[PDB]
Amino acid sequence: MTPIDESQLPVGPQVSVTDSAQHTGPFAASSPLTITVKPGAPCVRADGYQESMVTRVLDDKGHQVWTGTFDESKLIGGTGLGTATFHVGSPAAAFNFHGSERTTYRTLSYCAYPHYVNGTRERLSQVSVKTFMVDPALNLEH
């Protein structure tokens, strides 16, 4: 019942969101984006078996716009050392990006059980944050 320390938990899963063009921000409002998070740390359950990779995004107001989960268990002998990619898609669709100016988003990810908890929370591995900006008028075409 104490506050876990960074030295008590393993490393956190890297966060990197890029489009099909594998470019950086600002991104195009009419352009789909993909969130690619790397392991780096041995993520597993109590028994030592992979659980899942959580990845959600928060708007500028601090409201979660996106959310996803990957089944690390699928990785054979991975031990929580596999890359996790999610087809988020366009920012206006996935990140209900309803703005006419350069906005600043924030993505996060962690190896926490996908199941629901009574009230308290738990962190099996560190957490990484990745901020990205989007442009409402950058590129319309593909």
PDB file of C-alpha atoms in Angstrom:
ATOM      1  CA  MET A   1       0.000   0.000   0.000  1.00  0.00           C
ATOM      2  CA  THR A   2       2.907   2.326  -0.782  1.00  0.00           C
ATOM      3  CA  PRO A   3       3.872   4.543  -3.748  1.00  0.00           C
ATOM      4  CA  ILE A   4       5.896   2.444  -6.187  1.00  0.00           C
ATOM      5  CA  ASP A   5       9.288   3.902  -7.102  1.00  0.00           C
ATOM      6  CA  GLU A   6      10.919   4.044 -10.536  1.00  0.00           C
ATOM      7  CA  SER A   7      13.722   1.901  -9.114  1.00  0.00           C
ATOM      8  CA  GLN A   8      11.101  -0.619  -8.002  1.00  0.00           C
ATOM      9  CA  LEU A   9       9.565  -1.127 -11.445  1.00  0.00           C
ATOM     10  CA  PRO A  10      11.131  -1.987 -14.829  1.00  0.00           C
ATOM     11  CA  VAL A  11      11.646   0.377 -17.764  1.00  0.00           C
ATOM     12  CA  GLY A  12       8.715   1.929 -19.602  1.00  0.00           C
ATOM     13  CA  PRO A  13       7.538   1.172 -23.156  1.00  0.00           C
ATOM     14  CA  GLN A  14       8.791   3.789 -25.616  1.00  0.00           C
ATOM     15  CA  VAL A  15       6.178   5.854 -27.452  1.00  0.00           C
ATOM     16  CA  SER A  16       6.351   7.002 -31.074  1.00  0.00           C
ATOM     17  CA  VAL A  17       3.363   7.958 -33.223  1.00  0.00           C
ATOM     18  CA  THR A  18       3.953   8.293 -36.965  1.00  0.00           C
ATOM     19  CA  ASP A  19       1.944   8.134 -40.189  1.00  0.00           C
ATOM     20  CA  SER A  20       2.360   5.793 -43.160  1.00  0.00           C
ATOM     21  CA  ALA A  21       5.026   8.205 -44.400  1.00  0.00           C
ATOM     22  CA  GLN A  22       6.944   7.583 -41.174  1.00  0.00           C
ATOM     23  CA  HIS A  23       7.237  11.347 -40.709  1.00  0.00           C
ATOM     24  CA  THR A  24       6.926  13.648 -37.696  1.00  0.00           C
ATOM     25  CA  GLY A  25       4.676  16.520 -36.668  1.00  0.00           C
ATOM     26  CA  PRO A  26       2.917  18.612 -37.313  1.00  0.00           C
ATOM     27  CA  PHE A  27       0.737  15.972 -38.969  1.00  0.00           C
ATOM     28  CA  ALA A  28      -2.153  16.351 -41.413  1.00  0.00           C
ATOM     29  CA  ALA A  29      -5.711  16.402 -40.071  1.00  0.00           C
ATOM     30  CA  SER A  30      -6.815  14.390 -43.105  1.00  0.00           C
ATOM     31  CA  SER A  31      -3.858  12.037 -42.667  1.00  0.00           C
ATOM     32  CA  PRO A  32      -3.987   8.793 -40.641  1.00  0.00           C
ATOM     33  CA  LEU A  33      -1.481   8.276 -37.826  1.00  0.00           C
ATOM     34  CA  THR A  34      -0.131   5.135 -36.158  1.00  0.00           C
ATOM     35  CA  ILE A  35       1.097   4.749 -32.581  1.00  0.00           C
ATOM     36  CA  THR A  36       4.204   2.568 -32.362  1.00  0.00           C
ATOM     37  CA  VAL A  37       5.338   1.764 -28.821  1.00  0.00           C
ATOM     38  CA  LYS A  38       8.498  -0.222 -28.083  1.00  0.00           C
ATOM     39  CA  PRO A  39       9.058  -2.557 -25.103  1.00  0.00           C
ATOM     40  CA  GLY A  40      12.541  -2.031 -23.701  1.00  0.00           C
ATOM     41  CA  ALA A  41      11.556  -3.619 -20.398  1.00  0.00           C
ATOM     42  CA  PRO A  42      10.439  -7.158 -19.462  1.00  0.00           C
ATOM     43  CA  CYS A  43       6.683  -6.718 -19.061  1.00  0.00           C
ATOM     44  CA  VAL A  44       4.790  -9.662 -17.572  1.00  0.00           C
ATOM     45  CA  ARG A  45       2.115 -10.683 -15.069  1.00  0.00           C
ATOM     46  CA  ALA A  46       2.452 -11.989 -11.513  1.00  0.00           C
ATOM     47  CA  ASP A  47       3.289 -15.461 -12.821  1.00  0.00           C
ATOM     48  CA  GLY A  48       5.778 -13.896 -15.215  1.00  0.00           C
ATOM     49  CA  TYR A  49       3.626 -14.249 -18.321  1.00  0.00           C
ATOM     50  CA  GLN A  50       2.988 -11.385 -20.741  1.00  0.00           C
ATOM     51  CA  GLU A  51      -0.333  -9.618 -20.178  1.00  0.00           C
ATOM     52  CA  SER A  52      -1.014  -6.761 -22.596  1.00  0.00           C
ATOM     53  CA  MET A  53       0.246  -3.375 -23.784  1.00  0.00           C
ATOM     54  CA  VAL A  54      -1.952  -0.393 -22.917  1.00  0.00           C
ATOM     55  CA  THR A  55      -1.818   2.764 -25.032  1.00  0.00           C
ATOM     56  CA  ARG A  56      -4.065   5.817 -24.727  1.00  0.00           C
ATOM     57  CA  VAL A  57      -3.955   9.455 -25.834  1.00  0.00           C
ATOM     58  CA  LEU A  58      -5.011  12.635 -24.035  1.00  0.00           C
ATOM     59  CA  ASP A  59      -6.136  15.915 -25.598  1.00  0.00           C
ATOM     60  CA  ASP A  60      -4.874  19.376 -24.651  1.00  0.00           C
ATOM     61  CA  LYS A  61      -7.701  19.702 -22.126  1.00  0.00           C
ATOM     62  CA  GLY A  62      -6.521  16.497 -20.480  1.00  0.00           C
ATOM     63  CA  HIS A  63      -9.324  14.331 -21.850  1.00  0.00           C
ATOM     64  CA  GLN A  64      -8.583  10.864 -23.226  1.00  0.00           C
ATOM     65  CA  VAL A  65      -9.332  10.837 -26.955  1.00  0.00           C
ATOM     66  CA  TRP A  66      -7.782   7.524 -27.995  1.00  0.00           C
ATOM     67  CA  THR A  67      -7.305   4.153 -26.301  1.00  0.00           C
ATOM     68  CA  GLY A  68      -6.052   0.703 -27.251  1.00  0.00           C
ATOM     69  CA  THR A  69      -4.594  -2.551 -25.950  1.00  0.00           C
ATOM     70  CA  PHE A  70      -2.278  -5.185 -27.420  1.00  0.00           C
ATOM     71  CA  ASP A  71      -1.982  -8.846 -26.437  1.00  0.00           C
ATOM     72  CA  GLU A  72       1.712  -9.341 -25.674  1.00  0.00           C
ATOM     73  CA  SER A  73       0.894 -12.943 -24.761  1.00  0.00           C
ATOM     74  CA  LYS A  74       0.797 -13.632 -28.500  1.00  0.00           C
ATOM     75  CA  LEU A  75       4.557 -13.056 -28.541  1.00  0.00           C
ATOM     76  CA  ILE A  76       6.273 -16.437 -28.235  1.00  0.00           C
ATOM     77  CA  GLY A  77       9.062 -16.243 -25.675  1.00  0.00           C
ATOM     78  CA  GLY A  78       8.883 -12.478 -26.018  1.00  0.00           C
ATOM     79  CA  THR A  79       8.608 -11.918 -22.274  1.00  0.00           C
ATOM     80  CA  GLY A  80       7.161  -8.487 -22.990  1.00  0.00           C
ATOM     81  CA  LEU A  81       9.859  -7.497 -25.471  1.00  0.00           C
ATOM     82  CA  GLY A  82       7.816  -6.950 -28.618  1.00  0.00           C
ATOM     83  CA  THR A  83       6.836  -3.842 -30.565  1.00  0.00           C
ATOM     84  CA  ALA A  84       3.189  -2.789 -30.326  1.00  0.00           C
ATOM     85  CA  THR A  85       1.503  -0.950 -33.196  1.00  0.00           C
ATOM     86  CA  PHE A  86      -2.066   0.352 -33.371  1.00  0.00           C
ATOM     87  CA  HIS A  87      -3.892   1.753 -36.400  1.00  0.00           C
ATOM     88  CA  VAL A  88      -5.226   4.884 -34.698  1.00  0.00           C
ATOM     89  CA  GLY A  89      -6.059   6.590 -37.979  1.00  0.00           C
ATOM     90  CA  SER A  90      -6.821  10.239 -38.697  1.00  0.00           C
ATOM     91  CA  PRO A  91      -6.479  12.679 -35.768  1.00  0.00           C
ATOM     92  CA  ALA A  92      -9.873  14.274 -36.396  1.00  0.00           C
ATOM     93  CA  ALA A  93     -11.450  10.817 -36.222  1.00  0.00           C
ATOM     94  CA  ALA A  94      -9.401   9.098 -33.518  1.00  0.00           C
ATOM     95  CA  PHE A  95      -8.421  12.266 -31.655  1.00  0.00           C
ATOM     96  CA  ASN A  96     -11.701  14.061 -32.357  1.00  0.00           C
ATOM     97  CA  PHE A  97      -9.312  16.881 -33.256  1.00  0.00           C
ATOM     98  CA  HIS A  98     -11.820  19.708 -33.704  1.00  0.00           C
ATOM     99  CA  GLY A  99      -9.502  22.697 -33.969  1.00  0.00           C
ATOM    100  CA  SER A 100      -8.359  25.198 -36.587  1.00  0.00           C
ATOM    101  CA  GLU A 101      -4.863  25.699 -35.176  1.00  0.00           C
ATOM    102  CA  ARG A 102      -1.714  23.782 -34.239  1.00  0.00           C
ATOM    103  CA  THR A 103      -2.669  21.679 -31.216  1.00  0.00           C
ATOM    104  CA  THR A 104      -0.540  19.688 -28.775  1.00  0.00           C
ATOM    105  CA  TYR A 105      -1.499  16.094 -27.981  1.00  0.00           C
ATOM    106  CA  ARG A 106      -0.060  13.612 -25.485  1.00  0.00           C
ATOM    107  CA  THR A 107       0.232   9.841 -25.889  1.00  0.00           C
ATOM    108  CA  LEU A 108       0.992   7.300 -23.162  1.00  0.00           C
ATOM    109  CA  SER A 109       1.569   3.554 -22.844  1.00  0.00           C
ATOM    110  CA  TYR A 110       2.192   0.934 -20.159  1.00  0.00           C
ATOM    111  CA  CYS A 111       2.140  -2.822 -19.561  1.00  0.00           C
ATOM    112  CA  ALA A 112      -0.915  -2.982 -17.300  1.00  0.00           C
ATOM    113  CA  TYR A 113      -3.632  -5.639 -17.155  1.00  0.00           C
ATOM    114  CA  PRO A 114      -6.492  -4.835 -19.568  1.00  0.00           C
ATOM    115  CA  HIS A 115      -9.035  -6.109 -17.041  1.00  0.00           C
ATOM    116  CA  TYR A 116     -10.935  -3.652 -14.846  1.00  0.00           C
ATOM    117  CA  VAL A 117     -10.017  -2.885 -11.235  1.00  0.00           C
ATOM    118  CA  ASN A 118     -12.228  -2.199  -8.217  1.00  0.00           C
ATOM    119  CA  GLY A 119     -10.791   1.226  -7.454  1.00  0.00           C
ATOM    120  CA  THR A 120      -7.044   1.254  -6.849  1.00  0.00           C
ATOM    121  CA  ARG A 121      -4.551   1.033  -9.712  1.00  0.00           C
ATOM    122  CA  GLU A 122      -1.275  -0.802 -10.324  1.00  0.00           C
ATOM    123  CA  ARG A 123       1.783  -0.308 -12.532  1.00  0.00           C
ATOM    124  CA  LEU A 124       3.778  -3.343 -13.666  1.00  0.00           C
ATOM    125  CA  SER A 125       6.202  -1.304 -15.771  1.00  0.00           C
ATOM    126  CA  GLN A 126       7.249   2.333 -16.151  1.00  0.00           C
ATOM    127  CA  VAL A 127       5.297   4.707 -18.393  1.00  0.00           C
ATOM    128  CA  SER A 128       6.418   6.805 -21.361  1.00  0.00           C
ATOM    129  CA  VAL A 129       4.784   9.953 -22.734  1.00  0.00           C
ATOM    130  CA  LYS A 130       4.898  11.188 -26.330  1.00  0.00           C
ATOM    131  CA  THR A 131       3.538  14.601 -27.314  1.00  0.00           C
ATOM    132  CA  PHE A 132       2.542  15.276 -30.923  1.00  0.00           C
ATOM    133  CA  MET A 133       0.997  18.224 -32.766  1.00  0.00           C
ATOM    134  CA  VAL A 134      -1.553  18.150 -35.587  1.00  0.00           C
ATOM    135  CA  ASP A 135      -2.451  20.611 -38.343  1.00  0.00           C
ATOM    136  CA  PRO A 136      -6.065  21.113 -39.500  1.00  0.00           C
ATOM    137  CA  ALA A 137      -4.739  22.267 -42.872  1.00  0.00           C
ATOM    138  CA  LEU A 138      -1.523  20.427 -43.738  1.00  0.00           C
ATOM    139  CA  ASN A 139      -2.364  17.816 -46.375  1.00  0.00           C
ATOM    140  CA  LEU A 140      -5.776  16.825 -47.733  1.00  0.00           C
ATOM    141  CA  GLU A 141      -4.813  14.338 -50.445  1.00  0.00           C
ATOM    142  CA  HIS A 142      -3.395  10.918 -49.565  1.00  0.00           C
TER     143      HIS A 142
END
